[PDB]
Amino acid sequence: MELIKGQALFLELDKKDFLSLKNNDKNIPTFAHPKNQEKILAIFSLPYKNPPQNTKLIAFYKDKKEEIFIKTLEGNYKSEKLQVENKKIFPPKTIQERIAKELKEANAIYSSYTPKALFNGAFNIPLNSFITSDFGKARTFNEKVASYHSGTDFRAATGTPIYAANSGVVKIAKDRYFAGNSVVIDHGFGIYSQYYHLSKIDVKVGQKIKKGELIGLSGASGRVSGPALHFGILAGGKQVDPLDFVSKFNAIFQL
Amino acid sequence: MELIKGQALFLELDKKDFLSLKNNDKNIPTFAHPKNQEKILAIFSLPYKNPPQNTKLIAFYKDKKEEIFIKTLEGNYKSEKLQVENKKIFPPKTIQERIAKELKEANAIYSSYTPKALFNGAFNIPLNSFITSDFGKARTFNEKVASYHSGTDFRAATGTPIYAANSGVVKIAKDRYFAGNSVVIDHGFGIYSQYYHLSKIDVKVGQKIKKGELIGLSGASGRVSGPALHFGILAGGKQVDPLDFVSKFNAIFQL
Ligand SMILES: CC(=O)N[C@@H](CCN(CC(=O)O)CC1CCCC1)C(=O)N[C@H](C)C(=O)NO
Ligand SMILES: [Zn+2]
Ligand SMILES: [Zn+2]
Secondary structure (H helix, E strand, O other): OOOOOOEEEEEEEEOEEEEEEEEOOOOOOOEEEOOOOOOOEEEEOOOOOOOOOOEEEEEEOOOOOEEEEEEEEEEOEEEOOOOOOOOOOOOOOOHHHHHHOOOOOOHHHHOOOOOOOOOOEEEEEEOOOEEEOOOOOEEOOOOEEEEOOOEEEEEEOOOOOEEEHHHEEEEEEEEOOOOEEEEEEOOOOEEEEEEEEEEOOOOOOEEEEEEEEOOEEEOOOOOOOOOEEEEEEEEEEEEEEEHHHHHHHHOOOOO | OOOEEEOOOEEEEOOOOEEEEOOOEEEOOOOOOOOOOOOEEEEEEOOOOOOOOOEEEEEEEEEOEEEEEEEEEEOOOEEEEEEOOOOOOOOOOHHHHHHHHHHHHHHHHHOOOOOOOOOOOOOOOOOOEEEEEEEOOOEOOOOOEEEOOEEEEEOOOOOEEEEEOOOEEEEEEEOOOOOOEEEEOOOOOOEEEEEEEEEEEEOOOOOOOOOEEEEEEOOOOOOOOOOOEEEEEEEEOOEEEHHHHHHHHHHHHHO
């Protein structure tokens, strides 16, 4: 198989006699196929930065091993150079401390795996406008990816209502240094939707949210150049192409 | 405060001048807050069956009492009314003796309270699969709750490796009537994890186990309808929603 970096892929495996699915030592979780009682699914994602050329995954059964080979692909992401870089411009300590705490908090959440579906059907798009900045916009240096765009931005004037893309549990609902007013929902199975740069948060941590419920209002808060809604999906442990993911997910799960 | 039956809640209290926290007559133990040195914690659990509508706790300090009110919610559990062709006759006499003796042994263990932490940070789920039968699915013969599912079952084919959810000391590691092959671990502070219906046990009573370590193999043993791993948590003296509890626990104790 093949896969563009920063994308997720839904793997299908036989349910019967299945023990585990592994990428080296790291285990990869499995969930039931919705339309086929004899199958299970697993999500595999390639990081945007520094992917391997190739992945070999092993599905272990009672009676056999099934190898799965996945070649990384570069894709057609847009990319610009940078002309200066090295141990430069950090913030004040209590601000580094803020940056550090929030990273830790976020990583704890994205590491967590809720082993049931908190979603309800297909993902919807969080609002009905148009993309102004695509997933995977890179910035490069030493021919390496210095940074990339880890979600997709939708055009939004300040104050535009923003609806949960699917059902779930709110894990984050506060102001953060980079993302600004942030909401993050757990949908189950390590799948997380992200809504950043809001002007107003209308949910709180722990709250169960349904698909199409209002989570807040768009803004320009946090590290961003203007008002816009930033939409992200983390799955299989990584940030991946949100519209690509949604499209893959809904292929399997649409009710 | 509000709490759903069959859930645990972490109460935070001022450390200094604290003498005692009580629910009527019974004392509720307390342990240190892991981050904030000025605070202590307690765990309060409502039973699933026959909770009171309301609970009032007093925290006694040197110079004041402090009331904590907790109102029981019914929550949203699944529930199938029970046909009664006759809720009448029992199983044999040395078998009833088996049942009674094992119940007596388990209560001894669950009544204990080890006053220090045996865990090591956050809990993991004991394996990377999906839920096939949730906690709190009840069977309601007429108007009372006859029985309910006291843990959560994960899809597992017979032979699936099962890992300790946190570090601890093994208290039970043997075949019991209803649970089948059973491992139960003391994590400290009266928190116990449960692993039932196993096909093979790989630990001994009294053994020190580390989080992520192999405890045994999944199975179909005991009172269960097919292969599966059943995962439970006891805390505050009652069986509580184990994914909810894990999530609450990790929020405080994650390293
Ligand atoms: C990668 C990512 O998801 N970036 C986000 C927030 C940052 N944070 C992620 C999280 O905490 O979930 C991680 C930080 C990395 C180093 C320290 C913490 C963001 O605001 N992206 C750009 C600017 C944007 O949104 N353009 O529109
Ligand atoms: Zn963006
Ligand atoms: Zn069970």
